[PDB]
C-alpha cells in the first residue's frame with residue numbers, strides 16, 4: 001500500500017544531500033517534457049505518486065503550458081536517464097494545475113497529472129513504484145520534525161546540470177515563527193506554504209541538505225504512523241542550501257480536498 005519502503009543506507013554523499021536508490025522512495029517520479037517535434041526528452045520536474053494513475057507535482061513546473069501529449073511520467077527509476085529495469089513509464093492523459101497559481105509568489109504551487117492507460121489502472125504497485133500516504137487532515141507534526149525529501153534536480157543553484165542519480169536529503173520542518181517573509185528576503189509566504197531545511201552550519205563550510213532547481217514536484221515526506229506521509233511538495237527557495245534560509249514547500253494537507261475532488265472518473 002502506502003508509506004512503505006525497503007530503505008537502504010544511502011552511500012555517496014553529495015553537496016546538497018546524498019545519493020539514494022529509488023527503492024528508498026518508490027513514490028518518486030521523473031517527469032520528462034519533450035521539445036518541438038520529437039528532438040528528445042528533457043528532465044522537467046519530479047512527481048509524487050498518490051495512486052496508480054495520479055501523480056502530484058508542482059504548479060510552476062508547468063508554467064510552460066505544455067501540450068498534454070508532451071510529458072512522460074517515469075516511475076521506479078534510480079538514474080535520471082539510464083533506464084532502470086523495473087522502471088514503469090506512462091504517457092500523460094491529462095493534467096490539471098491549480099486555477100489560482102499566483103506565478104508571482106508560487107502561491108498554490110500544486111498540480112495533478114493523470115496517467116494515460118486504456119484502463120482505470122496504470123502503475124502496478126512494486127518495490128520501486130509505490131504510493132505515498134496523504135496526510136490526515138488533522139495531522140500536525142511537531143516543531144523541527146525530522147523529515148526527508150528526494151529528486152533528480154541540480155546540485156546547487158548555478159550548476160547547468162541535473163543529478164544523474166536520485167538524490168535524497170533530510171531536513172527539519174520549521175516552526176511557524178520562522179516560516180515568514182522576514183526570514184525569506186521579504187518574498188511572500190502564504191498559509192499554504194511551509195518551511196523546512198537543514199539547521200546545521202558553523203563548521204568551516206558545509207554541504208547543507210536542501211532541494212534545488214529540478215527538485216520541484218518532488219516530495220517532502222515525514223514518518224507518521226509507522227509510514228511515510230507526504231507533508232509538502234517542493235515549491236521554491238532562496239538558492240540552494242543558504243545558511244539560516246529554509247526551503248518553501250506546499251502544505252499538502254491544505255490541498256487534500258482539491259486533490260480529492262479533482263480525481264473525477
Ligand SMILES: *[C][C@@](*)(=O)[C]([C][C][C][N]C([N])=[N+])[N]C(=O)[C][N]C(=O)[C]([C][C]C([O])=O)[N]S(=O)(=O)C1=[C]C2=[C][C]=[C]C(N([C])[C])=C2[C]=[C]1
Nearest residue numbers: 187210211212213214215216235236237238239240247248
Ligand atoms: C520548480 C522547482 O524545481 C524549484 C524548486 C526550488 C527549490 N529551492 C529550495 N531552496 N529548496 N522552484 C523554483 O526554483 C521557483 N523559483 C525560485 O525558487 C527562485 C529561484 C531563483 C533564485 O536562484 O533565487 N527563488 S524565488 O524565491 O521564487 C525568487 C527569489 C528571488 C531572490 C532574489 C531576487 C529575485 N528577483 C529577481 C527580484 C528573486 C525572484 C524570485
